[PDB]
Write a protein that binds this ligand. Structure first.
Ligand SMILES: O=C(O)CCC(=O)C(=O)O
Ligand SMILES: [Mn+2]
Ligand SMILES: [Zn+2]
Length: 510
């Protein structure tokens, strides 16, 4: 006898088979197609469960569209509700629009979301943290856990009443009970691994963001299935006897773990792997779904404005290693809105700059996060520290400047490299981290390390996101409650002639 567990994670609102780079795109991804793979595959097993492991409420242009129209998650929830999931977990992105929007969403889902380590006042935010069920005369126990690092990323107003506890500690505290109650333990953690599964060597700074390895080295013998996410990696292997799974992102793959009984009648892991999501001749999309997609594409094709000249980004790396007209433009927009001495922004992975005709699609692709902004008062010394952190993005390989492995593995984080405007500087990649920034000047004046300056950063940075801890608790000079996308749209609307002065002036070399 057997049971299959199917898991999707970090779907990020990618429901349709497209990443929205162009209107007619179709590619083997998204929840509709991932779910079709599961429905076809599950028929071979005696029984099966379907699980979503977090980061489902934000990410894609579809989510941007919902916020800009109904303001409700119902159209997204509808897709999830017709698929008959058994349970899910909370990812960090479920808090991006505030606690009331999340609570409303959980009420509308027709399955439970399990989170044992996030508390609201004196009890768990979600109704439950653990769930048990039977498979023959055996009991399965499932515990849902989420990365504790949320306060380093989210707007304070969105999480003020919450308490985030270590996933390792809550698991440890629940194991005794779960071991008494169940024969099989499933842990669903919206977090990943801070050390390599085989070597055990750290693969990132041990901040507590990711605790999966610690959880496995300490409790593997009692954990039968370890479902993970957050890092967007594709992992399907065994840690000792534990089946470990991480099924990527955007419905590109589906995780499947199968358990089967012995003659003794005890359940044991039979297989653990990732199933690829592929197109096939039986897959169809309902007419109502196709109609929703059309509304979405028409909205993305909405023309914002026409520019006199082009500002396309051909090679993203080239626009990070030296000033580019598009990064100069975004920084100028921030300096004009904020009135700060300095401003900064990352060049996101999906940014392609602007062409002469700018549509809603291009705007979203250049700034696809719902970040607002803050002007912080920082000393000249703290500013240098911030530039030094960004300079860690580079490394020297084969005698030339390249992107550091730290910022590419195990997950790309181009969003953690900032390009600064209002300040000129030199980065010397061949020098030790922490002492790579030179020639800092602000308006024909060397940066006085003891003088106070103002810098406009996004809210993610303001709370230390991306290891920019020098901004935590800096005095807030101004809270700009306008998201990045709209801030650009407003700028385009008011600056017809697009006479943009040069505010980005820096260079990167050995
Ligand atoms: O919002 C940002 O700038 C950081 C991006 C982020 O939070 C993520 O990709 O997980
Ligand atoms: Mn996540
Ligand atoms: Zn994610």
């Amino acid at each position: 006898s057997n049971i299959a567990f199917y898991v999707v994670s970090d779907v990020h609102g990618y429901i349709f088979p497209t990443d929205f780079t162009s209107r007619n795109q179709y590619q083997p991804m998204g929840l509709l197609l991932a779910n079709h793979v599961i429905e076809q595959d599950r028929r071979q097993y005696d029984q099966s469960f379907k699980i979503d492991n977090g980061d489902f409420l934000q990410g894609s242009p579809f989510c941007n569209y919902l916020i800009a129209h109904s303001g409700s998650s119902q159209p997204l929830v509808d897709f999830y509700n017709r698929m008959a999931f058994d349970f899910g977990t909370l990812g960090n992105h479920e808090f991006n629009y505030g606690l009331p929007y999340l609570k409303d969403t959980l009420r509308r889902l027709n399955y439970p979301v399990l989170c044992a380590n996030i508390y609201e006042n004196d009890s768990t935010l979600t109704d439950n943290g653990v769930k048990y069920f039977q498979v023959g005369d055996q009991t399965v126990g499932v515990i849902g856990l989420t990365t504790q690092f949320i306060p380093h990323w989210e707007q304070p107003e969105h999480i003020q009443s919450l308490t985030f506890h270590s996933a390792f500690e809550i698991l440890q505290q629940y194991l005794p009970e779960m071991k008494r109650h169940a024969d099989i333990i499933v842990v669903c953690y919206h977090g990943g691994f801070e050390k390599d599964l085989e070597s055990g060597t750290p693969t990132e700074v041990l901040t507590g963001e990711n605790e999966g390895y610690a959880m496995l080295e300490a409790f593997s013998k009692d954990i039968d299935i370890f479902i993970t996410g957050h890092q967007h990696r594709q992992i399907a292997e065994r840690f000792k006897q534990t089946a470990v799974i991480q099924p990527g992102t955007r419905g590109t793959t589906v995780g499947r773990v199968v358990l089967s009984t012995d003659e003794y009648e005890n359940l044991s892991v039979e297989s653990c792997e990732l199933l690829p999501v592929i197109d096939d001749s039986t897959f169809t999309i309902d007419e109502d779904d196709q109609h929703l997609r059309k509304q979405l594409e028409d909205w993305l094709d909405y023309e914002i404005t026409t520019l006199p000249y082009d500002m396309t980004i051909n090679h993203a790396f080239e626009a990070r290693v030296a000033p580019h007209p598009f990064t100069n433009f975004m920084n100028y927009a921030l300096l004009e809105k904020s009135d700060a001495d300095v401003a900064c922004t990352a060049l996101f992975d999906s940014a392609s700059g602007f062409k002469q005709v700018v549509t809603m699609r291009d705007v979203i692709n250049n700034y696809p996060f719902p970040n607002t902004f803050k002007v912080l008062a920082v000393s000249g010394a703290k500013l240098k520290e911030a530039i030094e952190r960004s300079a860690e993005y580079f490394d020297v390989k084969n005698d030339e400047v390249s992107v550091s492995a730290d910022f590419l593995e195990p997950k790309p984080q181009h969003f953690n490299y900032d390009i600064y405007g209002g300040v000129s500087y030199t980065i010397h990649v061949g020098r030790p981290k922490g002492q790579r920034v030179s020639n800092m000047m602000i308006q024909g004046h060397a940066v006085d390390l003891k003088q106070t300056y103002t810098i406009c950063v996004n809210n993610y940075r303001a709370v230390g996101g991306g290891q920019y801890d020098m901004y935590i608790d800096a005095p807030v000079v101004k809270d700009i409650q306008v998201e990045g996308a709209q801030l650009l749209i407003d700028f385009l609307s008011n600056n017809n002639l697009m006479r943009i002065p040069q505010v980005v002036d820096f260079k990167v070399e050995k």
